Symmetry: D2
Subunit: 461 residues, 4 copies
Amino acid sequence: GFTDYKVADITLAAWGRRELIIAESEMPALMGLRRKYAGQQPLKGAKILGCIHMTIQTGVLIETLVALGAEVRWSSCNIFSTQDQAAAAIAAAGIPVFAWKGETEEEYEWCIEQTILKDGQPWDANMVLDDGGDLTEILHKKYPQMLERIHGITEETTTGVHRLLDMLKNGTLKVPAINVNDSVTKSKNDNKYGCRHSLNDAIKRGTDHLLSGKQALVIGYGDVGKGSSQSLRQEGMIVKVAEVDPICAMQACMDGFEVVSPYKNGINDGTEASIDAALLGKIDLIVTTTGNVNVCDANMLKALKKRAVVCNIGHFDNEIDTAFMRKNWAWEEVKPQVHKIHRTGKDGFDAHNDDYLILLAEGRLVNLGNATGHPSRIMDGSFANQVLAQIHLFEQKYADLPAAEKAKRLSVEVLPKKLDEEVALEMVKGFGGVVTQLTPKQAEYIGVSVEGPFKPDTYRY
Amino acid sequence: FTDYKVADITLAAWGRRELIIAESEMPALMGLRRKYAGQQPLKGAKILGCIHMTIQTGVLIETLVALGAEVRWSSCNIFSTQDQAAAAIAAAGIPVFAWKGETEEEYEWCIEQTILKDGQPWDANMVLDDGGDLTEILHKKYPQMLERIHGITEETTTGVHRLLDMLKNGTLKVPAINVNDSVTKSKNDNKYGCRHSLNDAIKRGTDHLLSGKQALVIGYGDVGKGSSQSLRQEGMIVKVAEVDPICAMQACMDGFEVVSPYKNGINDGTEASIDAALLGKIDLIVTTTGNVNVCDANMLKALKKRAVVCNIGHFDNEIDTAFMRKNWAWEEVKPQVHKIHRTGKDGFDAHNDDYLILLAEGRLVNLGNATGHPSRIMDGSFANQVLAQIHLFEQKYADLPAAEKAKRLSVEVLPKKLDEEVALEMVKGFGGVVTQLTPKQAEYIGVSVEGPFKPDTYRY
Amino acid sequence: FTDYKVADITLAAWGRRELIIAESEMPALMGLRRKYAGQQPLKGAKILGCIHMTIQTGVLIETLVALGAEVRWSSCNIFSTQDQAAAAIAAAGIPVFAWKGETEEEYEWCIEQTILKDGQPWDANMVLDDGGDLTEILHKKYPQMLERIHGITEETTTGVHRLLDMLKNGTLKVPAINVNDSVTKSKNDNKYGCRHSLNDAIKRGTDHLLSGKQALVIGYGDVGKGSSQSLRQEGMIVKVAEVDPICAMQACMDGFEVVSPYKNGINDGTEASIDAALLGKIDLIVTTTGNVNVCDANMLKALKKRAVVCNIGHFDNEIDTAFMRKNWAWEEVKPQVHKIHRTGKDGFDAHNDDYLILLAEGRLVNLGNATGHPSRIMDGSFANQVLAQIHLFEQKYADLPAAEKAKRLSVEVLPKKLDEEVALEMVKGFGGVVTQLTPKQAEYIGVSVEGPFKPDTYRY
Amino acid sequence: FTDYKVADITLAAWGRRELIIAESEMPALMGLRRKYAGQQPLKGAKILGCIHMTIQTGVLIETLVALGAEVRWSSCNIFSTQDQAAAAIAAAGIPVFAWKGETEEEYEWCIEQTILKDGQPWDANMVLDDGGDLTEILHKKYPQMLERIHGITEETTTGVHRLLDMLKNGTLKVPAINVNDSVTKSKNDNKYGCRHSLNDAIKRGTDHLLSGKQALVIGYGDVGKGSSQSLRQEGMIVKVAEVDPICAMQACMDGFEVVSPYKNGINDGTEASIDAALLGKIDLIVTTTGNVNVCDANMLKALKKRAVVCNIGHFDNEIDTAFMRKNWAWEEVKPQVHKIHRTGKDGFDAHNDDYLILLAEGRLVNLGNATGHPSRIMDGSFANQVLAQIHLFEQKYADLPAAEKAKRLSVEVLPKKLDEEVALEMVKGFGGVVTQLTPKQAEYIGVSVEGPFKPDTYRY
Ligand SMILES: NC(=O)c1ccc[n+]([C@@H]2O[C@H](COP(=O)([O-])OP(=O)(O)OC[C@H]3O[C@@H](n4cnc5c(N)ncnc54)[C@H](O)[C@@H]3O)[C@@H](O)[C@H]2O)c1
Ligand SMILES: NC(=O)c1ccc[n+]([C@@H]2O[C@H](COP(=O)([O-])OP(=O)(O)OC[C@H]3O[C@@H](n4cnc5c(N)ncnc54)[C@H](O)[C@@H]3O)[C@@H](O)[C@H]2O)c1
Ligand SMILES: NC(=O)c1ccc[n+]([C@@H]2O[C@H](COP(=O)([O-])OP(=O)(O)OC[C@H]3O[C@@H](n4cnc5c(N)ncnc54)[C@H](O)[C@@H]3O)[C@@H](O)[C@H]2O)c1
Ligand SMILES: NC(=O)c1ccc[n+]([C@@H]2O[C@H](COP(=O)([O-])OP(=O)(O)OC[C@H]3O[C@@H](n4cnc5c(N)ncnc54)[C@H](O)[C@@H]3O)[C@@H](O)[C@H]2O)c1
Ligand SMILES: Nc1ncnc2[nH]cnc12
Ligand SMILES: Nc1ncnc2[nH]cnc12
Ligand SMILES: Nc1ncnc2[nH]cnc12
Ligand SMILES: [Zn+2]
């Protein structure tokens, strides 16, 4: 009887299920939570609006939430990141999902709206799980009455957290949030090692280019930029790194990279004369990792070496000025999510023109657009933190609190270190790792309990 | 001038040549000399210093002096002094009591010579410490001196732990800056410094090939991360031990197998709990923890014949060297390199195969068997030290009214803005070029164009 | 009549777009097109080709044709064709019989379609082969055709071994060039190609994280060196098996532990000789040997649950997949990815935990589950192929008298000077700049300024 | 015993302690000592040896003696002797003339003391040489001695070139074994030895941070490959120069940018041909070529201020140090470390910023500023030397009639089977376990189960 979904092809469900069964075996933290909490049903009565890339890994997350008692309605947080077999397997399990690979922007917004509304009216949602803040923004702008009954938001990614903190600073945030991104088992696992795995993967799938011996420029050296620069350097690329943050730049130097700017002396005067044309004319690959806007700008695109590959692994596509390219240059599709952008003019191109760039995933997050994003064993950490964060906020029942008590709990918080450690331990056991137990004397010597937590909250890892 | 004690004053010219080179490798510190020369922000400061008397420390000392300070100096380890650096500092008219190869008694005597001048307490008003030994002696033996001291600037993880313990117990008498937890210290010195200097020290002491051999690194904090890289980049097969599952997760993701010396990780102190099969394959063990007895007697008994044993944490009690002194025979190979013969206490066969090689008698190996971290790394740590000395000296805690002392008695870190400023000088030293945000970009991410660029929660 | 057979001719435009990109990545091959355009050195050549029908092979084919040849083409593996490449070649009017996912019967039919044109032997006069299957079929079934063939140019290590065996037995009927042993082939394609494409294929088939997991690479020749790097650079903990102690020495020095699947390295053919403790910790096994049964049934039984098994040597008999077909149940995950359930032959539980994952049914994994080596690497191999075709075609062995044919049967390599010339074009493709020797320098080391730069004994 | 000259005989006990350690790191060489002690295959051999008088050479010498030889020894470089090794050898009753820091006159005198015993030619019958200086002196000055010599075993690439030049000109008087081109020498010592010892020597001489800095390695043969890895593994950004496009292709594929010091690679002797922008960014230049003047005066003028300059090829003429001696002022930092002030010849300002740092006066830096390659690597080279000495001594060329000498007068390598046997012992030293081929597998690949495993064409 179940029809409350919209996916590319329901017949892919059996394939998706085969891949979910494999992914379960690669996600011991998440599966450990399923086993530990199945009896208690800590999410019984939770009704979760979810908006995160509809991948196989998200499928295991969804089914864990459901196994713990929740009901959900789901969409993807990017137009190209859904794996159609994952979406189909979730729909076939009776779970509302509105997601397919290759959505238009209009369809993207419609999919989020289908999670929010059931049978033409607001669903009885009481929790939000978001990656990037688009669902959170729609709820605040269009559905404030729904937020009265929502207990919390659990936010996945750096960009989404920034958006929440902006709302909190402006006094416009209506429900408390957990910053899942800043668990160490998320930020220093997913953001870094996930991109290490999936950046080179996506570039190979899209282009099949040799990377060894070629020149790359990675814009940014935060967690994504660190993992991205390693993805490339481990393949034998000669990688240069750009940064605005001198501490991150110092790390890039010490890690063995030359630190450069696309602009002469680092100063963008807005003119083509401020571009380091000599530097850009030697770059074969540019990757944006910043979470910022226009860090690969029009003048940089004009100066790049002929046939350079351009991609973005930050959350939103506006890292690269693709609007400039759409307005001015001719796009030739090579295959899905791979375009040659011909710099010779807007109306048509010579099939044998040499003056083009190759753009991956139309500038949208390349790892998910041209490959399958991060691997299950990495997403295990992020998604175990999501489950714990959902349990915590659902149990706190913010929406049921009196006004004076809401005022004290309206915050953006992280999970306690003890839980971060518990996720990490399950990850380590998945690798067959064996953690040593402190003796009582050793635990006393460093001032911790034998079971942890092992570090002060100031610790950076 | 006679108010010093060093191994050999005639090494001064060599030390000075090396200081002049080190200046060229320390642009953050040299930038501070230029920036603050006019103000003389340390005029009237009288600084008790206790930190490894290396060439890099020499550049630190001379920066403090160039900013107006007077100092009295000792090393914080018996084997870490570079005798040419000590000589060059003494030859400049600066009181220094330090040499490579001190006894424990001589070590304590050197610290006491900084504290006392012409037989009585110096009129010290600032403390710069690495590991907390000087801080401990002042609190326990010279509490009256602390009434006139404005602050302590503490270099290293172990020393900071000790300060935070004092603050929690209410026994810390003056405010402190935790220099260790600047990012340009902890995530530069503690990690990349050990990356550079661990393999260096092992090569100088043993000249052993590392490629293809098996290592066990105990700990995966900043020092353990850098140490594991030092070995793996040489082609060692490195296994990592940890108690902290987050640090263990990082070791797995970084490409290491995570193992325990004890079966199932359970250290009951019995020989039966040792993973003898694992330890019997290890060619090199390195301790990085800041903890006690992490390479214990039963582990030492089980190690592969001819394994190398060393420690790069602050104190030698990471390894049970007392057990080895009590039970086994020590044959000096050359200074700071001993073969420890597991055949018994009273003599050894010159051709015995059942020995371990211990470096620096278990004391920090990078400084003991080589020269510690390189100048361009120590530039970051020591720029932070100078800024921290300026900050606490200018605050004049000792002279504050009682109500204001109560509010300022704390262990603090430097502001992120200054950490970034030190980083930028370091980056320029490499020829790196940082990009400047446009106004639109700065608005988009919610920061000022000049920084700071990250919230205080950020981990890098 | 369409004198081709491909999966889907509508993929031609896509293939053509990818050919145009690949041309830009293959400067040695495109340089040959330009250099030899005038001469048409392959005018009159009629080349039977059997090599993986990829985009890279497409550029090779079109270079041969641009130099005057006519060709008839098939793939040398059932899973290696890129259907868009085959379509683009068919659409250009070139006979090609190839698709991804051939049966063994279809594979042999495709080779036969190259050999026969319109129901009779084509008037072939040249052979280009990868692995020796076409060479074998010609000798076994069409020996009269070899009377008119001037030579064979053989791509890969396995094919060369087969040719040398024929030469030793007196069964080889035409001379050959060993293309594999150009340095710009063996030490480029076999090593760096596998470095690029092994981890690529494993990711596409499984999307498994590799970092922190345990791999066993069987063999450490050129393919094993590149394969081990592919995995270790992703953070795998890689162990290496070898029978050749020189290759094993290189693996140790490169930072790998060298192990055997068998106790003390001795296989007695029973499960008791398996190192079950070792195999029970392995997450991925990769065979690279060119040998037979190097991942045998007893090893397969002992592997860790849910281990990935794959082969990157030329033929699938490196792994005992016949044992698995006879005894265990195969569940297709997706094309070229099977779970092999060790619970029995007749069915499986969808939730069984005791399975292995086999890629490409044991056929070469880089081509089966991804797209093989990248264009910029295949540029070197395929430049050598073109040069080898030119050389043998020009020599005209088939036109020699019978007594002279007997004396001119050999297996030769290309001269070092040409290997250097290919390498120079590759380097220029990266933007590299080679220095020119001064006359004094060239005299000092005993070479010509233009090369060759090394004696024939040199191993690089 | 007085028939020696060393720096300080009292260092003998230290040398012996280090020899005993080195023995445990040299299982191939010690395996030969044990295997051949009974047979005494070198009984009656009288070996003139000229190779770096290190601890590793000490183990070599004592192995030759243990097998029956008598020797007379000198070093083949003025800065490479370890004085404790020389003392330990002299204290064992073995004639050795070597110390660290010889003058050129003393260097020649030391070689002459090996050649002459009590003022007259020794009754030498074998030569062991590293670089050809002893070989050249014998041919030019002592041709009568060569009549009674059975062979030369030559260690290094430069020496082999010199022998092959003599053979080509018809001036080589006795047969030679090219020890360099065993795989367990060239692809072990030349590459992995330099990987270990280059960064070691730079750190000992300068204590400079390498991570994040720019290096230029001139050459990408075995020494250049190992050198480039030594630097890149420490986090240097390494660029590579080459004249050989095949070696340059390998550098690109290995992840390096390939550059020339000269515009378009044309070294026309002019200042304007220097790529000033490139050289002005280089912090470290290392020469690895075996060629002459590859770091020339115009390059030295253009280098970044405070760049480090060193050579790891056999001879110091890779760098134009004569130009620097004639034009610039040298300030000794410490032994084997000079600042070269580009401000003029007559004195310098102690605070001048415009200088270069030269290590070991341009002589081989790994031996000059550190201890060269490690024992476990030199084990391979020196096991090959022992085998080569045995082979040529047993052949007794000097006793053959003139017509029979003609057939054996050649420069040859050891058989692959022996190369494999050395490698196996090396692998067992790491605890590696080689797999034994089954008879069916050996048949499949066409080899004997015991080896050799590869054709003579194989490049590894
Ligand atoms: N694709 C993925 O799977 C994935 C995974 C995790 C996070 N992300 C996204 O990637 C982005 C980066 O995340 P993060 O965790 O690395 O954030 P981060 O804050 O740790 O790092 C971003 C870095 O970009 C630098 N930067 C900003 N503007 C710059 C400019 N103009 N030039 C150069 N450098 C500049 C900043 O200084 C900072 O160090 C965010 O959008 C985040 O949501 C994507
Ligand atoms: N030698 C040097 O030049 C140098 C440089 C910087 C710091 N240090 C010293 O090195 C030590 C480590 O400093 P750090 O910054 O890395 O500290 P840290 O807190 O970052 O790391 C120490 C690690 O040891 C682990 N650990 C504790 N007990 C353990 C046990 N029994 N087994 C395994 N792991 C265990 C902890 O979990 C932690 O991750 C300190 O003593 C510090 O003062 C030395
Ligand atoms: N997939 C690809 O794209 C690709 C590329 C190049 C070559 N190849 C194929 O890969 C195979 C290997 O080629 P190669 O050039 O490396 O050959 P190689 O001769 O250089 O190396 C093969 C190695 O396998 C080792 N070996 C043999 N039997 C063994 C055993 N039982 N256990 C352990 N090690 C064993 C040998 O000692 C040898 O070192 C061949 O079949 C070749 O045709 C495939
Ligand atoms: N220091 C050590 O311990 C040590 C060890 C082994 C060998 N060596 C010596 O090192 C030298 C190199 O030995 P190798 O075995 O690497 O020789 P090799 O022939 O393998 O390599 C030398 C390389 O230098 C390149 N080259 C020549 N002239 C050049 C120039 N003008 N610019 C750039 N590149 C140029 C050549 O093309 C060649 O690839 C020899 O002198 C050898 O005796 C030293
Ligand atoms: N595989 C994945 N699933 C969900 N979110 C992701 N973010 C990055 N990779 C992802
Ligand atoms: N070189 C050095 N000088 C001072 N303190 C140090 N800590 C580590 N290395 C050091
Ligand atoms: N340690 C060493 N001893 C002898 N010859 C060498 N060549 C390189 N290193 C050496
Ligand atoms: Zn999102």
